[PDB]
Amino acid sequence: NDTVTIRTRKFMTNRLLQRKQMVIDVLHPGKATVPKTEIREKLAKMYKTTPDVIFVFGFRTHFGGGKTTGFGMIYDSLDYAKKNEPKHRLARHGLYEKKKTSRKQRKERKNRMKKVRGTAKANVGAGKKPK
Template identity: 80%
Template sequence: MVTPDVVFVFGFRTNFGGGKSTGFALIYDTLDFAKKFEPKHRLARHGLYEKKQQTRKQRKERKNRMKKVRGTKKTKVGATSKKGGKK
């Protein structure tokens, strides 16, 4: 028996005039497999993934911090969530 939480449907197209739609579905054995292979936007539709909301200002500050460093150091700068603010 397949439960609805392991069925992921997408790509629906409605036929002309309505009444019939065709689409695609992926059915996983377990929820863990679904979380491993499904894209995050499809998991969010099922309520299994919550994207962290970033404000526009936070994105802009992060971008400008990353512009100041070069190479592999960018990942370290981008990962820091809080930095000592200047007044």
């Protein structure tokens, strides 16, 4: 925080996704690649926004520390971004709850559904006894 500066380039506007996309660079001369959570608040405060509609990813520092490149993602609202945002980032910072079974059990269940013919009761029952 004492010697950590955030710079931005390729700054562009689009209410297309009611959002603004710009690639960023961070200076951390005597420390590791900085975590995202506090620099999110940094971008929020120097654009006078809340540190929650701010999304950012893809931090790859260069050789020997120093500059780290990442793509910042600012938006207009939590809900507007909620409509159009990939789910994985919404699960990184917990805002979209992600919990489903692994693909193997789902495929097995699908094969069980295609096994039982037509009737809803046996079909919906094809996961009760095949639990």
